[PDB]
Amino acid sequence: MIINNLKLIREKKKISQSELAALLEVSRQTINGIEKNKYNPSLQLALKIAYYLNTPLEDIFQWQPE
Amino acid sequence: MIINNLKLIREKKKISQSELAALLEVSRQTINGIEKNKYNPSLQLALKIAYYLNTPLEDIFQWQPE
């Protein structure tokens, strides 16, 4: 479903969990938790992740049938 | 936060709450529930909502500093 493949993008740019999380102003554990199973980020926060991370939602959040 | 002011966009094109929800493959209850206050949509689903709705997430989910 969500897949939360943000980390792949993060490692893609060699991104650290701390930096974008710093950019997001949210806990690093949460951000690196989301890729695992942590409650999905709020839509604007997702926009922020995309906007600050500089990547479209689709790439960071994989598209699935569901 | 999210605001979920999708409704306004949905009314804006005279979109049926039912129709996109069907496109999304989710209940109107949920889709029209989210705009009211129901749990925020799955991020991937959100992509789909904008995708079927044909409008950016930000329009439906406006930006709030937090």
- The helix or strand, by DSSP H or E, that contains position B7, with its residue range, turns out to be helix B6-12
Q: B61 and A40 in contact by Cβ < 8 A?
A: no
Report d(CA B29, CA A33) in Å as an integer: 30
CB-nearest partner of A2 from B40, B44, B61: B44
Q: What is the CATH number of the domain that holds A30?
A: 1.10.260.40
Return contacts of B8-17, CB within 8 angstroms, 24+ apart.
B9/B53, B9/B55, B9/B59, B9/B60, B10/B35, B10/B53, B13/B53, B13/B54, B15/B53
* Dist CA A51 CA B3 (whole Å): 19
Total domain count, chain B? 1
The coordinates were experimentally obtained by: NMR
Domain residues for the domain of B65 are 1-66
Contacts of A40 in chain B (CB under 8 A): 42-43
